[PDB]
Every structure is written in C-alpha cells, then in structure tokens.
Scaffold this motif. Structure first.
Motif, mmCIF file in Angstrom:
data_model
loop_
_atom_site.group_PDB
_atom_site.id
_atom_site.type_symbol
_atom_site.label_atom_id
_atom_site.label_comp_id
_atom_site.label_asym_id
_atom_site.label_seq_id
_atom_site.Cartn_x
_atom_site.Cartn_y
_atom_site.Cartn_z
ATOM 1 N N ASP A 42 0.848 -1.176 0.000
ATOM 2 C CA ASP A 42 0.000 0.000 0.000
ATOM 3 C C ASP A 42 0.882 1.224 0.000
ATOM 4 O O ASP A 42 2.154 1.104 -0.014
ATOM 5 N N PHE A 43 0.233 2.401 -0.021
ATOM 6 C CA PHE A 43 0.963 3.652 -0.088
ATOM 7 C C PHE A 43 1.990 3.896 1.052
ATOM 8 O O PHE A 43 3.136 4.206 0.808
ATOM 9 N N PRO A 44 1.587 3.751 2.303
ATOM 10 C CA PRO A 44 2.628 3.989 3.351
ATOM 11 C C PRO A 44 3.817 3.037 3.298
ATOM 12 O O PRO A 44 4.950 3.408 3.684
ATOM 13 N N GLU A 45 3.548 1.812 2.840
ATOM 14 C CA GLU A 45 4.610 0.805 2.680
ATOM 15 C C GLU A 45 5.577 1.180 1.577
ATOM 16 O O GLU A 45 6.787 1.149 1.750
ATOM 17 N N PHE A 46 5.043 1.604 0.459
ATOM 18 C CA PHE A 46 5.831 2.146 -0.593
ATOM 19 C C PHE A 46 6.614 3.348 -0.147
ATOM 20 O O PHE A 46 7.807 3.474 -0.394
ATOM 21 N N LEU A 47 5.898 4.271 0.474
ATOM 22 C CA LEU A 47 6.493 5.461 0.940
ATOM 23 C C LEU A 47 7.669 5.168 1.897
ATOM 24 O O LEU A 47 8.707 5.835 1.851
#
Ligand SMILES: [Ca+2]
Ligand SMILES: [Ca+2]
Ligand SMILES: [Ca+2]
Ligand SMILES: [Ca+2]
Length: 147
Positions: free
Chosen positions: A63-68
């Motif tokens: 998800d986005f926070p993981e990518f981030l």
C-alpha cells in the motif's frame, strides 16, 4: 525524518504508476508488468520477494505507506552517500580523485580548523590505508565512519 507535502504527493504520483488498476495496493502481477514494460523479466519467485520485503503488514500487497517507507529509506541512503561524496569533493580541491596533505590543510583552514604540519601528516597517515601518501574516496569514507 519528516517528509514535506510535495515529497509525499510526488511519491503518490510514483505509487500511481505501479498501481495499474488504481486499487491502492501493488500486486506481484502489477509489479511484473511495470518491470517488463522496462526490459526486465523476473520470476514469480523474485516478484514475490520484492513484494514481501516491502509488505510490512503481510497482507500480500504493497500500500501507499509501505511504498512510501521504502522510498524514504532509499532516499535517506542516497542522501548519505551524496553527503559523503560532496564532502570529498570539497576536500579534493584539484578534483583529481585524491585528497593531498596540502589540500587537507588548505580546506581544513578554510573551515576554521588551522592544523600544524605534523597534524596534517598524521591525519593523512591515519586514513591512508594503501600508503600512497594521499586519501582516495574509499579511504575517506572508511575514516569518516571511524567515529
Ligand atoms: Ca493494484
Ligand atoms: Ca501491505
Ligand atoms: Ca586532489
Ligand atoms: Ca591512499
């Protein structure tokens, strides 16, 4: 450690590229597409690793926070490398790939640290692993770490 709002939204932009169906999570499949669409052909196994190592919540996708958080860690590593490279460049006054005793003296002075001849030569010798009388980039990194 805090990112700015523009770094976060650029990162969202980047995430968007990977997230082919825009469902807010990146799958092994989607990851494979993006790479193939750049020359690469990885095994399912390898795709599964790349996802899994990023997949902090083990739900199978990114998800986005993981990518981030990945991006921020890469960014922090690049930054540090760059900082070390820039510092070397400041010392390496003739841009020859080595810091000489004279270059270390002059620069050390211009940073408000005036050294003796003896202290200059000691500082070169400490760092000078291969004994050639000058400090190359990996000697400079080595000795910077020592601390
Ligand atoms: Ca998706
Ligand atoms: Ca996840
Ligand atoms: Ca030099
Ligand atoms: Ca050397």
């Amino acid at each position: 450690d805090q990112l700015t709002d523009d770094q976060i939204s650029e990162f969202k932009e980047a995430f968007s590229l990977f997230d082919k169906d825009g469902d807010g999570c990146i799958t092994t499949k989607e990851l494979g597409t993006v790479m193939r669409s750049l020359g690469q052909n990885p095994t399912e196994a390898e795709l599964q690793d790349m996802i899994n190592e990023v997949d902090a919540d083990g739900n199978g996708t990114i998800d986005f926070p993981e990518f981030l958080n990945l991006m921020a860690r890469k960014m922090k590593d690049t930054d540090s490398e760059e900082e070390l490279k820039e510092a070397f460049r400041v010392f390496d006054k003739d841009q020859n790939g080595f810091i000489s005793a004279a270059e270390l003296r002059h620069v050390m002075t211009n940073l408000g640290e005036k050294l003796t001849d003896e202290e200059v030569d000691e500082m070169i010798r400490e760092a000078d692993v291969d004994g050639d009388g000058q400090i190359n980039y990996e000697e400079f990194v080595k000795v910077m770490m020592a601390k």
